[PDB]
Design a protein around this motif. Structure first.
Motif, PDB file in Angstrom:
ATOM      1  N   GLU B 218      43.562  35.224 -15.923  1.00 28.61           N
ATOM      2  CA  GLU B 218      43.066  34.206 -15.021  1.00 28.61           C
ATOM      3  C   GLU B 218      42.808  34.764 -13.623  1.00 28.61           C
ATOM      4  O   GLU B 218      41.750  34.475 -13.061  1.00 28.61           O
ATOM      5  CB  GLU B 218      44.031  33.036 -14.965  1.00 28.61           C
ATOM      6  N   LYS B 219      43.736  35.590 -13.077  1.00 22.41           N
ATOM      7  CA  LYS B 219      43.557  36.182 -11.739  1.00 22.41           C
ATOM      8  C   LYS B 219      42.382  37.164 -11.689  1.00 22.41           C
ATOM      9  O   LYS B 219      41.623  37.139 -10.729  1.00 22.41           O
ATOM     10  CB  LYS B 219      44.845  36.852 -11.231  1.00 22.41           C
ATOM     11  N   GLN B 220      42.243  38.024 -12.723  1.00 23.29           N
ATOM     12  CA  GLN B 220      41.188  39.029 -12.859  1.00 23.29           C
ATOM     13  C   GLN B 220      39.842  38.366 -13.075  1.00 23.29           C
ATOM     14  O   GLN B 220      38.819  38.915 -12.653  1.00 23.29           O
ATOM     15  CB  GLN B 220      41.485  39.999 -14.019  1.00 23.29           C
ATOM     16  N   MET B 221      39.836  37.181 -13.723  1.00 25.79           N
ATOM     17  CA  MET B 221      38.607  36.436 -13.950  1.00 25.79           C
ATOM     18  C   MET B 221      38.157  35.774 -12.672  1.00 25.79           C
ATOM     19  O   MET B 221      36.953  35.703 -12.412  1.00 25.79           O
ATOM     20  CB  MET B 221      38.768  35.451 -15.104  1.00 25.79           C
ATOM     21  N   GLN B 222      39.133  35.356 -11.828  1.00 22.68           N
ATOM     22  CA  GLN B 222      38.896  34.753 -10.506  1.00 22.68           C
ATOM     23  C   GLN B 222      38.229  35.756  -9.567  1.00 22.68           C
ATOM     24  O   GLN B 222      37.265  35.398  -8.896  1.00 22.68           O
ATOM     25  CB  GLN B 222      40.195  34.220  -9.901  1.00 22.68           C
ATOM     26  N   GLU B 223      38.708  37.017  -9.562  1.00 19.94           N
ATOM     27  CA  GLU B 223      38.175  38.145  -8.784  1.00 19.94           C
ATOM     28  C   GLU B 223      36.774  38.509  -9.238  1.00 19.94           C
ATOM     29  O   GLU B 223      35.908  38.718  -8.398  1.00 19.94           O
ATOM     30  CB  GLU B 223      39.106  39.370  -8.909  1.00 19.94           C
ATOM     31  N   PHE B 224      36.546  38.548 -10.577  1.00 23.21           N
ATOM     32  CA  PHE B 224      35.259  38.841 -11.224  1.00 23.21           C
ATOM     33  C   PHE B 224      34.207  37.813 -10.832  1.00 23.21           C
ATOM     34  O   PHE B 224      33.136  38.206 -10.360  1.00 23.21           O
ATOM     35  CB  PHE B 224      35.414  38.946 -12.757  1.00 23.21           C
ATOM     36  N   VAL B 225      34.518  36.498 -10.980  1.00 24.76           N
ATOM     37  CA  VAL B 225      33.566  35.443 -10.589  1.00 24.76           C
ATOM     38  C   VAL B 225      33.211  35.553  -9.099  1.00 24.76           C
ATOM     39  O   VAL B 225      32.042  35.464  -8.733  1.00 24.76           O
ATOM     40  CB  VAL B 225      33.937  34.002 -11.038  1.00 24.76           C
ATOM     41  N   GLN B 226      34.218  35.856  -8.274  1.00 25.02           N
ATOM     42  CA  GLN B 226      34.074  36.041  -6.842  1.00 25.02           C
ATOM     43  C   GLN B 226      33.138  37.219  -6.549  1.00 25.02           C
ATOM     44  O   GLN B 226      32.327  37.137  -5.616  1.00 25.02           O
ATOM     45  CB  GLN B 226      35.449  36.261  -6.191  1.00 25.02           C
ATOM     46  N   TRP B 227      33.238  38.297  -7.357  1.00 23.21           N
ATOM     47  CA  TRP B 227      32.374  39.472  -7.210  1.00 23.21           C
ATOM     48  C   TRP B 227      30.925  39.151  -7.614  1.00 23.21           C
ATOM     49  O   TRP B 227      30.005  39.686  -7.011  1.00 23.21           O
ATOM     50  CB  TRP B 227      32.933  40.669  -7.987  1.00 23.21           C
TER      51      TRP B 227
END
Ligand code: APC
Ligand code: APC
Ligand code: MG
Ligand code: MG
Lengths: 322, 322
Positions: B218-227
């Protein structure tokens, strides 16, 4: 309307039984809120030894007109008598469940699993055969010539009942809104994964029945789950609770599709939890099944409870053949 | 026999024995891929056969292991800018073809839709043919002799791409975590409706790659969408952004199944949003595709970017036949 009732009553005098029965049916097809036809047909039906149907008519008459004297004197006599008749049938079912509580039975159980799927899907219009269903579930290979949707209805059922039997059946505690969404998630998942496991967003029609608006579905589902984990429902005979749970869900119609299938599975959950075999409403019984569901919308849930009880007896009889 | 192979490869390189040395160099790196001296030697060797791109990869690999290796530095200090220009030129060649692509074309577009499904499913092991896929999607009838799961993979793809094209493509705004879960909801919905549209709960292995733990997904997906909705990614060439988005998702592996399929579709979302045709990685290209994905895990995403760029050119070339 009144012309048919005066004709039906005259036909009833001296003879013409079937001429009057169809005439009485005509007067109610013309106007089902005909207080005088209902009591007349009720008094007529009681002669052919059908007290249950008579009481239904006197009851239907009283909801329309509460102080109708002829309907009252009749109902004041049938109400307790019909309640005893119903209570006796439940004891007959209990004695058979006592008999079923005690290699040949195992061969019946495995085939009735494949059979339950056949009927639950066919009742919705699935053209698949019991041999095709038995193939689909064993090989996991596609049946040639039949649509994908129809075979995905079958896989979906199987996933739903394997889920109920492993997770739900033996589980201790209260039945939740998540449990119902989880059964639906498998029922409809292989056919419509977008709408599977979620509440209806649009407004639909089921025959002549208009279910609660999608905005109120969540609230009505909250009340229903609360009723399942209430003690009034817990005090009912297992067959009566299972039929009521089934009617109530079906009435709310919280899903675009798979309402009837999820209800029939929730019904079996209730039954099996109280030590009753799972029950099967047959493909051939469709017309009666929709008739008794209509009769409940109209105000009387009793015919549906008797229907579900006739099904429980026919399932208990089939097991006691061995 | 690690340093033994390198001293043998270098001797074979002297006066002749080209293919004897190439396999010897490959042996020394198969023995130890962190052999700084083999990497620079193979790099200097490859540059002779006119392959500067591979050479630079080797000098780069050598430097990540040993940053002050003089032979790797003097070589890399020359290839780094040269290889960046080579890459930048290929992107301009792709742009000129997309400018050229900006009744005969309509017949290519419709068949390439059915074709894209064929390859995206086959690359994962789907035994279905293009004629069977074309049948399944047109008749909605089951292909005789093939498993339901394989045909449900096909329906799933179709639902996913019809969704992206109607909802997502033209949509103005930022790409969200809900959009990715919505694509996955369709991709895997007809095969596993329980895990479709949801994040991985267990830990998995993809070749030799161990993705983030389900607790961190969930945290890594949050960073990815943000990127994806950042301006650094927005400043990259469309092909480089689409390849990086695909690698990053595939790296996180947030789903039990359908990661490759969702990534390949998210890649096409990025491309199409910047006015590029959708791209197809072929069934035959599988072995190279997994090789370049391994090379990125190792530290260098460039070979995968060039792979995705070779795919974009081969897709632009096929369109310009008419
Ligand atoms: N008159 C009626 N009033 C209310 N519910 C009714 C009804 N007649 C039938 N039903 C219920 O609604 C179901 C049919 O509803 P539909 O909207 O036609 C599709 P469905 O929910 O997909 O049912 P399914 O699971 O049997 O396929 C029946 O199986 C039954 O349980
Ligand atoms: N070395 C590697 N490191 C990271 N990802 C890799 C990889 N090799 C392959 N992959 C990616 O992971 C996918 C395969 O992952 P799996 O866990 O085997 C099943 P999957 O997600 O169902 O993939 P699918 O949609 O192609 O079937 C490939 O299609 C590719 O995109
Ligand atoms: Mg239906
Ligand atoms: Mg796979």
């Amino acid at each position: 309307a009144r012309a048919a009732l005066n004709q039906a009553l005259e036909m009833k005098r001296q003879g013409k039984r079937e001429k009057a029965q169809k005439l009485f049916m005509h007067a109610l097809k013309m106007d089902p809120d005909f207080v005088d036809a209902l009591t007349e047909f009720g008094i007529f039906s009681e002669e052919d030894k059908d007290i249950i149907q008579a009481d239904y008519l006197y009851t239907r008459a009283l909801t329309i007109s509460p102080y109708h004297e002829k309907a009252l004197v009749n109902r004041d006599r049938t109400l307790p008598l019909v309640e005893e008749i119903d209570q006796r049938y439940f004891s007959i079912i209990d004695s058979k469940v006592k008999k079923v509580m005690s290699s040949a039975l195992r061969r019946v159980m495995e085939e009735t699993y494949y059979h339950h799927i056949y009927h639950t899907v066919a009742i919705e219009g699935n053209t698949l055969t019991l041999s095709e269903i038995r193939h689909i579930l064993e090989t996991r290979y596609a049946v040639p010539g039949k649509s994908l949707e129809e075979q995905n209805e079958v896989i979906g059922m199987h996933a739903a009942m394997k889920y109920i039997n492993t997770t739900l059946v033996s589980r201790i505690g209260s039945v939740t809104i998540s449990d119902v969404l989880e059964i639906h998630r498998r029922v409809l998942g292989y056919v419509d994964p977008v709408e599977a496991g979620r509440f209806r967003t649009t407004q639909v029609l089921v025959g002549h029945h208009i279910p609660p608006h999608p905005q109120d579905v969540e609230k009505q589902m909250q009340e229903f789950v609360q009723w399942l984990n209430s003690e009034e429902a817990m005090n009912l005979h297992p067959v009566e609770f299972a039929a009521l749970a089934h009617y109530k869900l079906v009435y709310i119609h919280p899903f675009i599709d798979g309402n009837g299938r999820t209800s029939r599975l929730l019904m079996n959950l209730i039954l099996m939890q109280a030590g009753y075999p799972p029950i099967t409403i047959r493909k051939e019984q469709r017309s009666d099944y929709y008739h008794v569901l209509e009769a409940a919308n109209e105000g009387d849930v009793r015919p549906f409870i008797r229907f579900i009880a006739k099904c429980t007896e026919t399932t208990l009889d089939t097991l006691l053949f061995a």
